[PDB]
Each structure stands twice: as structure tokens, then as C-alpha cells.
């Protein structure tokens, strides 16, 4: 938003094998990076065995 | 510990400013540079006995 890149997160140990467990939690604000560019596409970096 | 990192950008090329957020081992490196990415970018972990 307006050149500020906001990152939110929360970590939780879970049991469910395939999907989000029924429950609710909120993500913390962490950091709000000052990145003054436009974004419309993105990619995920992954680890490969 | 597989899904490690993200890539952001409008054209995902070396003509438009791009974002790279690498959650590598022991560190997180966030760069905003004119990057020329791989057609299939990723990271690779290799075991040692």
C-alpha cells in the first residue's frame, strides 16, 4: 500500500494432514518494509531435494 | 523446511524493479534490485553425511 510493503505472520503447530484445521487465529504485524515499487505478479522460492 | 522465499514484481524481468525475499538458512535477505531471474528460480539443499 502506497510504497509500504507490509508483512504479517503467525506460526502454529497443527495436526490436520491436508487442510487448515477448524479454528481461528490472527497474524501479527511484524514488519512494514519501505519498498516503493509496484507489484502485480509473484513467485514462491522452494527447496529441492 | 522446504518453502523458503518469495519473488515480487510487475513484469518479473530486468526492465522493471523487482523484489526478492530469501528466507535462507540463519538469515533473511530482502533485496530490491533490477534482477534477471531464472526461468525456473529456486534454492537447493544438499545433504552431507
Amino acid at each position: 500500500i502506497d510504497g509500504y510493503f507490509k508483512i504479517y505472520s503467525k506460526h502454529t503447530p497443527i495436526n490436520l494432514v491436508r487442510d487448515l484445521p477448524q479454528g481461528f487465529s490472527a497474524l501479527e504485524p511484524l514488519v512494514d518494509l519501505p519498498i516503493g515499487i509496484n507489484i502485480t505478479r509473484f513467485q514462491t522460492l522452494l527447496a529441492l531435494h | 523446511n522446504i518453502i523458503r522465499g518469495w519473488i515480487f514484481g510487475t513484469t518479473l524481468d530486468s526492465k522493471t524493479q523487482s523484489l526478492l525475499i530469501v528466507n535462507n538458512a540463519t538469515n533473511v535477505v530482502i533485496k530490491v534490485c533490477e534482477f534477471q531471474f531464472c526461468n525456473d528460480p529456486f534454492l537447493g539443499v544438499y545433504y552431507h553425511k
Partner: peptide
């Protein structure tokens, strides 16, 4: 102190434009 070396060309506020491609080339 300032007098070639300085250049100048809608955008969202607080944004960068580091592209010099042609907007025929201009």
C-alpha cells in the same frame, strides 16, 4: 553547488520509475 548531470522525466505516491524504455521511440 549545483551549477547534464541532473535529469527529469500518473504514479502512485511514493513510487519509483527506473525504466528508460521508449514510450516509434522517444
Amino acid at each position: 553547488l549545483d551549477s547534464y548531470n541532473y535529469l527529469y522525466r500518473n504514479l502512485k505516491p511514493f513510487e519509483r520509475d527506473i525504466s528508460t524504455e521508449i514510450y516509434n521511440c522517444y
